């Protein structure tokens, strides 16, 4: 009762929060672990992702040893603001939120021996650079790097509380991904060097693989069907000039519409992806199918076709015979090269 | 030991007045600045600004903060920044900026025994960049970042790049979505006025836009459509349905390309090189259809006009491309 208040008031008498524990005597060792409640959405346009974590930091401060009936002291956040705490920040964080609804989501616990546990709930938005050269068959390793902002390697070092594989724990229902598949995470620590000195950095990499089925149904299949439709015109009789002309131009318009829509579904990057080359090839095939018809029509001598009751009628063009084989063959070879190129990496 | 550091800090902060600059009555205090750029993102052509995150370090000497008997550099808690004097440094072209505060306010204060103070900040700032996009997408941009003192002239404060040309790091590690950083420059100069000279630092980049996507999605399809519109010249003049359907469908396709590139590309309300090229191809397919209308009127209301057009149209279009690509490259 009153002993609790006495111990609380006695703790901070003479304490100086401006100085890290063991300043000039030893290295302040911080043990950290992360529990990911939800691996939130990944934004391709902004090249960033959101993550909701329970961040836990533990360290020893001999200046806060206490003796009393209780073994653990739980500190109010106001009192927790009067005590030195690590200035841990995320190197690739962009705009993070420390929730304080309805109260500050922080918790400071002190054991009798002076060991402090500091747990906080955070929402971190971190940038994940992406190589979209293999879109939509790409895989990424979105990193999460954190460490001390002001204290060098000679003052504060971070370590994982348990074995690094088990130190970062992701909830079973954590994944909130529509377009990716969270395969796993790797946990490691390293050293960085800035203009202010050497720092210890704790890194966690989440490995994501994009789902391809949506682009197969929305983009790849309609483009393949449109190319087959354009090559179908090779089987129409050469005297149906308006029919094959309308077929060719309307297939070109259909391909243009599909190309535009397929590009609107891709984040705004200025380099060429795999789907850009696939659409460009389909565009080239439909263009060639129409130039081929222009060449067939240029040699059609007679304007009347063969009739069932059968006067001289035109024979089947050798260009059409060649194209009925070459175009499906060339398109099948392109498909095999494209898929074996990108699906085997 | 530790109590000695505590008393040293108490002595340093005893009688310190944050309202007075170092060497208040003497020479101006030299402030050295260096910037470590973490990333550049959201280079917006519509808003004419870019957003960058950087580690902004400032070094200056304050004899009031000189301590002896401790052979270590005292890295103190960031809240001690509220108890010291820091330069009134602001970014002139900044539109919206903030300092990250997770898990705490991302700033540092490191003291050296001779009195040198290191004051570091982690700042994400959206800086204005007026862009000339008349040559878009074959353009280059020059986006700057101005650093100035709000209320001090060159008699009170001075700025310089600590480390010279090596002051700014991380430029070569940046990878923008639709740009490519060519070079960056550091400029130190004084803004001379009647009242006095004001220190100013300028960090500038040169962005070169990548052209692969525009080649694949804008120029090549328009060229293919324009070439397709020439097929009408090799069909017999009496095939009215075929030639009219081909001409008006190529016009519809060109309109579809123009309007969808209008929606897809950023809203830049003035004439660009992409608009001139799209309009040129639209005019060419319009004239290709008007040629057939003229031929049909001549014949009914003739192989020479078609033979002439089969050469003139490819030649004129090739000359237009040659002039276009020589003008903007």
């Amino acid at each position: 009762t009153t002993v609790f208040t006495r111990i609380l008031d006695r703790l901070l008498d003479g304490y100086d929060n401006r100085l890290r524990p063991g300043l000039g005597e030893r290295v302040t060792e911080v043990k950290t672990d992360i529990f990911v409640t939800s691996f939130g959405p990944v934004s391709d346009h902004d090249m960033e992702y959101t993550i909701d974590v329970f961040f836990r930091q533990s360290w020893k401060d001999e200046r806060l040893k206490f003796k009393g009936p209780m073994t653990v002291l739980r500190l109010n956040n106001l009192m927790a603001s009067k005590i030195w705490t690590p200035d841990t920040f995320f190197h690739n964080g962009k705009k993070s939120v420390a929730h304080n609804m309805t109260m500050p989501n922080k918790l400071l616990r002190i054991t009798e021996d002076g060991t402090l546990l500091y747990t906080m709930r955070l929402t971190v938005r971190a940038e994940c650079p992406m190589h979209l050269e293999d879109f939509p068959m790409d895989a990424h390793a979105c990193p999460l790097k954190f460490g001390s902002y002001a204290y060098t390697r000679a003052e504060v070092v971070y370590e994982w509380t348990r074995e690094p594989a088990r130190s970062v724990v992701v909830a079973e229902d954590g994944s909130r991904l529509n377009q990716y598949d969270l395969l796993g995470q790797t946990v490691d620590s390293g050293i960085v060097q800035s203009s202010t000195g050497e720092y210890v950095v704790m890194t966690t990499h989440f490995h994501l693989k994009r789902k391809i089925g949506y682009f197969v149904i929305q983009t790849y299949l309609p483009c393949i069907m449109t190319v087959i439709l354009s090559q179908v015109s090779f089987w129409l009789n050469r005297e149906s000039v308006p029919a094959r002309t309308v077929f060719g131009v309307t297939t070109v318009l259909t391909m243009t519409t599909l190309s535009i829509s397929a590009r609107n579904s891709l984040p705004k990057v200025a380099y060429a992806t795999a789907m850009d080359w696939f659409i460009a090839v389909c565009y080239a095939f439909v263009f060639s199918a129409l130039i081929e018809f222009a060449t067939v029509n240029y040699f059609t001598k007679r304007g009347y076709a063969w009739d069932g009751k059968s006067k001289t009628f035109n024979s089947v063009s050798k260009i059409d015979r060649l194209s009925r084989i070459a175009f499906p063959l060339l398109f099948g070879i392109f498909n095999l090269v494209y898929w074996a190129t990108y699906l085997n990496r | 030991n530790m109590s000695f550091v505590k008393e040293t800090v108490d002595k340093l902060l005893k009688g310190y007045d944050i309202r007075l600059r170092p060497d208040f009555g003497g020479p101006p205090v030299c402030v050295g600045m260096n910037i470590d750029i973490a990333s550049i993102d959201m280079v917006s052509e519509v808003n004419m600004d870019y957003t960058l995150t950087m580690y902004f370090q400032q070094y200056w000497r304050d004899k009031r903060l000189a301590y002896s008997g401790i052979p270590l550099n005292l890295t103190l808690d960031n809240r001690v920044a509220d108890q010291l004097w820091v330069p009134d440094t602001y970014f002139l072209n900044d539109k919206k900026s903030f300092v990250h505060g997770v898990t705490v306010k991302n700033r540092m204060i490191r003291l050296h025994p001779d009195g040198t103070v290191l004051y570091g900040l982690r700042i994400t700032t959206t800086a204005a960049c007026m862009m000339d996009l008349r040559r878009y997408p074959l353009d280059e941009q020059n986006c700057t970042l101005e650093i100035e003192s709000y209320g001090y002239t060159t008699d009170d404060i001075e700025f310089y790049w600590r480390g010279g040309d090596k002051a700014v790091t991380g430029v070569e590690r940046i990878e923008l979505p639709q740009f490519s950083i060519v070079e960056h420059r550091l400029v130190s100069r004084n803004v001379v006025f009647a009242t006095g000279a004001y220190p100013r630092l300028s960090l500038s980049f040169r962005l070169k836009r990548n052209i692969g996507y525009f080649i694949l999605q804008t120029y090549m399809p328009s060229i293919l459509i324009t070439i397709l519109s020439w097929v009408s010249f090799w069909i017999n003049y009496d095939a009215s349905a075929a030639r009219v359907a081909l001409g008006i469908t190529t016009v519809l396709t060109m309109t579809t390309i123009n309007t969808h590139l209008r929606e897809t590309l950023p809203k830049i309300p003035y004439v660009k090189a992409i608009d001139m090229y799209l309009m040129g191809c639209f005019v060419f397919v319009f004239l290709a259809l008007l040629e057939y209308a003229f031929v049909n009127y001549i014949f009914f209301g003739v192989n020479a006009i078609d033979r002439w057009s089969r050469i003139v149209f490819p030649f004129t279009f090739s000359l237009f491309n040659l002039v276009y690509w020589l003008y903007y490259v």
Partner: nanobody
Amino acid sequence: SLRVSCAASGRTFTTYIMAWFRQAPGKEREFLAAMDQGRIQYYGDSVRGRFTISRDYAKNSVDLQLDGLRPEDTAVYYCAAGAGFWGLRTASSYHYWGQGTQVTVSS
């Protein structure tokens, strides 16, 4: 003191993880060091504090500084670059591999 370089051509590795690997004769391929886009340096236990990795982003190259060499280090050294998919220490995560260099140490 020995310095080993690794020039990269045909592709800019600004946003790729550039690493060094050691392959003892017949044993296996051993991870030595790495550096990602953010200049974070990773090292193996056997070479922690001994080897230094540095990246020349302008010249698109990665250098390795070997100090305190031992007969155990006599092996083939490779230069690797990859996205670090499924761990940045596994050799299976790296795709671009150098032709290799032979280092022989005699005392």
